[PDB]
Design a binder for this molecule. Structure first.
Ligand SMILES: [Fe+3]
Length: 817
């Protein structure tokens, strides 16, 4: 009596050597236990041969036949051990036992000698702890214990140990004191989400900073391999910082290309005829995977970037006040604008430190289309993009840097009767303290279409967008998605068994997150990394995100809560989503509520399948340990806050899962995939400002009058950092062809529970339904103003589906790039 089995695997390089005694499997009983209650284990069974039957098997996968000596007396198998005797590791896809038991593995199996304990895999059945078959209970807990490790040791490539550590690996003090950075996390001064522990040990000069490493470890299965090298987008950041950036820098050091852009056409040239660079620079770029997909080239001297979506219909539309305001609700960073319910706007900052903080904007100077200020306030037509209190504490130190000058800005917006937003004033604030050496002062700038006044207003918009791009990159994007999510990924693997229903519900939403984050700590947010060298704050960039994290609230990440907290919607039970938008045609929010509702329905239908009552949640030992750790360790610097859900009810479980899935999928997609589409034209999304407004009677002032484009270009991001920044956002705005989107799973057998599978199928049908609805919105002529704007760019960032590439649409399951 033998059990026919089929093993599917993928050789490292993407067959006969797997035969003989190279690979052994041992079935484990889920019903028959030894003298210790542990499922009985069969004999070592090696692969018998290659199965070349079923056409249903692609992706460089190969199937192997195998038969197990398993009598009905050994009970029913529910798990199995596997040992790889070969030198090289292989990727185990699955095991299928006929007469059907399925095992979804998708895990790298290294040589048996590298493992402390034998790799164990479970059948695709789902069990809360109290439902674990008795013979698998100890195996279940031992595997979790193996995943947690002991909190010590330098992690190796094949390790599968999940643990936490602070952000003490960004500075490079051993190379230079100038690259020393404060540790983020673990202090009241610098609170911060934790990240995955790597354990490389301390630097030589600072026992609190982790030494450098050529490879930043992530548990093995978190490091996603790809069939196509072009899909390994995450490695592009490393290549860009380590290889391409130096190549670009040499071209400028050698004066082979003008150091600065001299006109707007010089910028447009980048995606038209291209930029000519030294042959050796082109040759350095053209052969790199991922990087070579970023530019078209003649193979000799030309690099051509792709035409950004924002200029595809009108190359000048970005300069309109209409587009400036529209992007606050349908642009790359559509989630910062707030309702303004009083006037003038107020500040909570200390005047003793920054000087009188009262606003200089006068109500009578504003054009509110005939409305009085009281009418605008009462009708909820006044809004603002407020970076005054956020930036003021950092303005002095930023402006002390050689090539950086910024203002803490505030923009007032009026919601017109036609439903579009219009900018009516920009306040450019600077701190003032007795003894300041600078004579520059704060000022208010009003809209202007002609003369030098129009140039000053255009520059004021640039200062505002430099604040916005910095806040978007560091807070809306990095902190709120990438960084805030990692602690939950770690806790999930450490406390929820692969058999756990919540593990199955949440893990698809973590795909590639730890991997891109580790590569980010190494090349994106590190000392002298991409962000520090391309954005305004320089060496103060990441710590600014720590200051902002002091105010991060998990429950305020829920879309309705966010909209209400920002004063852009009010609670209204008579509405489908329970909230009424104050800007009715707010694309991000309107489309977002649809996706939010679909995820909610899915979570509300899934949870009840495994938890009947609130008591079943309080009594799930794994679930309680998971949440307790996620909060007290993962986001431990905020463990003293009262807003954390308790997770003692079905309601709380649904809430926590819904928010986690929202952040990982739709929120990240909405703030991530519009980076190159909107920011690919540096004038539309400047990452830095290098000078304050000029004083009358100076050559700089005369320049605003005689050469406004040059005045603008000298103020924003320089040409070299612009080339580096455009390259990184082009990578980050690209969808890998092997992405798994919302409504999809990487395997149709993730669970054997038909009820869960049916619920998931309904969720995907609902997303398709939603996409048709969003298409109708974009085609509705009455919504053209905010959904398309003068740039005529349909808001498709929350469309659920997408083909590969730089598409400006599609919601992946996770923070995958
Ligand atoms: Fe991202």
């Amino acid at each position: 009596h033998k059990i026919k089995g089929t093993v599917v695997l993928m050789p490292k390089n993407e067959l006969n050597a797997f035969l003989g005694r190279s690979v052994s499997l041992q079935l484990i009983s889920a019903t028959k236990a030894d003298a210790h209650g542990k499922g009985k284990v069969g004999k070592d069974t090696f692969l018998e041969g290659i199965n070349t039957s079923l056409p249903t098997l692609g992706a460089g996968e190969s199937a192997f036949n195998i038969h197990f000596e398993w009598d009905g007396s050994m009970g029913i198998p529910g798990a199995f051990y596997i040992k790889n005797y070969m030198q090289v590791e292989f990727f185990l896809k699955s095991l299928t036992l006929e007469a059907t038991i399925r095992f979804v593995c998708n895990s790298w199996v290294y040589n048996t000698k590298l493992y402390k304990s034998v790799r164990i895999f479970f059948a695709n059945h789902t069990y809360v702890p109290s439902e674990t078959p008795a013979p698998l209970v100890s195996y279940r807990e031992e595997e979790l214990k193996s995943l947690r490790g002991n909190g010590t040791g330098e992690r190796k490539e094949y390790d599968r140990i999940y643990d936490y550590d602070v952000y003490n690996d960004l500075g490079n003090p051993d190379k230079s004191e100038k690259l020393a950075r404060p540790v983020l996390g673990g202090s009241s001064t610098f609170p911060y989400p934790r990240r995955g522990r790597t354990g490389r040990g301390p630097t030589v000069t600072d026992p609190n900073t982790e030494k450098q490493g050529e490879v930043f470890y992530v548990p093995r299965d978190e490091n996603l391999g790809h069939l196509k090298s072009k899909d390994a987008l995450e490695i592009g950041t490393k290549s860009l910082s380590q290889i391409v950036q130096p190549a670009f820098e040499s071209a400028f050091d050698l004066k082979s290309t003008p150091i600065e852009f001299h006109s707007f056409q010089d910028v447009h040239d980048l995606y038209e005829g291209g930029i000519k660079l030294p042959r050796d620079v082109i040759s350095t770029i053209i052969p790199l995977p991922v990087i070579k997909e970023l530019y078209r080239t003649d193979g000799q001297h030309i690099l051509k970037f792709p035409q950004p979506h924002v200029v595809q219909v009108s190359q000048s539309a970005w300069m309109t006040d209409e587009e400036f305001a529209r992007e606050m609700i349908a642009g790359v960073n559509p989630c910062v604008i707030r309702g303004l319910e009083e006037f003038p706007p107020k500040s909570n900052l200390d005047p003793a430190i920054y000087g009188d903080q009262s606003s200089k904007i006068t109500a009578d100077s504003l054009d509110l289309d005939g409305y009085t200020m009281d009418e605008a306030l009462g009708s909820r037509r006044l809004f603002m993009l407020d970076y005054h209190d956020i930036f003021m504490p950092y303005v002095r130190q930023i402006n002390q840097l050689n090539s950086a000058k910024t203002y803490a800005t505030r923009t007032i917006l009026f919601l017109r009767e036609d439903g579009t937003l219009k900018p009516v004033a920009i306040e450019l604030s600077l701190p003032h303290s007795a003894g300041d050496l600078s004579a520059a002062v704060s000022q208010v700038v009003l809209p202007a279409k002609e003369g030098v006044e129009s140039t000053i207003w255009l520059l004021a918009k640039a200062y505002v967008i430099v604040n916005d791009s910095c806040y978007h990159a560091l807070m809306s994007h990095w902190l709120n998605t990438h960084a805030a999510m990692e602690p939950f990924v770690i806790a999930t693997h450490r406390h929820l068994s692969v058999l756990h229903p919540i593990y199955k519900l949440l893990t698809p939403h973590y795909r590639n997150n730890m991997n891109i984050n580790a590569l980010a700590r190494q090349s994106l947010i590190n000392a002298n990394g991409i962000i520090e060298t391309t954005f305004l704050p320089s060496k103060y960039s990441v710590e600014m995100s720590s200051a902002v994290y002091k105010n991060w609230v998990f429950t305020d990440q829920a879309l309705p809560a966010d909209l209400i907290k920002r004063g852009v919607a009010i609670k209204d039970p008579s509405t489908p989503h329970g909230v009424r938008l104050l800007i009715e045609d707010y694309p991000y929010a309107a489309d977002g509520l649809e996706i939010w509702a679909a995820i909610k329905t899915w979570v509300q239908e899934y949870v009840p399948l495994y938890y009947a009552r609130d008591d079943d949640v309080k009594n799930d030992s794994e679930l309680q340990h998971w949440w307790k750790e996620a909060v007290e360790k993962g986001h431990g610097d905020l463990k003293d806050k009262p807003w954390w859900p308790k997770l003692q009810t079905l309601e709380d479980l649904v809430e926590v899962c819904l928010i986690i899935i929202w952040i990982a999928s739709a929120l990240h997609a909405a703030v991530n995939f519009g980076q190159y589409p909107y920011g690919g034209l540096i004038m539309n999304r400047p990452t830095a400002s290098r000078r304050l407004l000029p004083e009358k009677g100076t050559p700089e002032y005369e320049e605003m009058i005689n050469n406004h484009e040059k005045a603008y270009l000298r103020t924003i991001t320089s040409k070299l950092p612009t080339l580096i920044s455009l390259s990184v956002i082009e990578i980050l705005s690209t969808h890998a062809s092997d992405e798994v989107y919302l409504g999809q799973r990487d395997n149709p057998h993730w669970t054997s529970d038909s009820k869960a599978l049916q619920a998931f199928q309904k969720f995907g049908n609902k997303l398709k339904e939603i996409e048709e609805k969003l298409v109708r919105r974009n085609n509705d002529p009455s919504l053209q103003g905010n959904r398309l704007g003068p740039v005529q760019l349909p808001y498709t960032l929350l469309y659920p589906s997408s083909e590969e590439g730089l598409t400006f649409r599609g919601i992946p399951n996770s923070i995958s790039i």
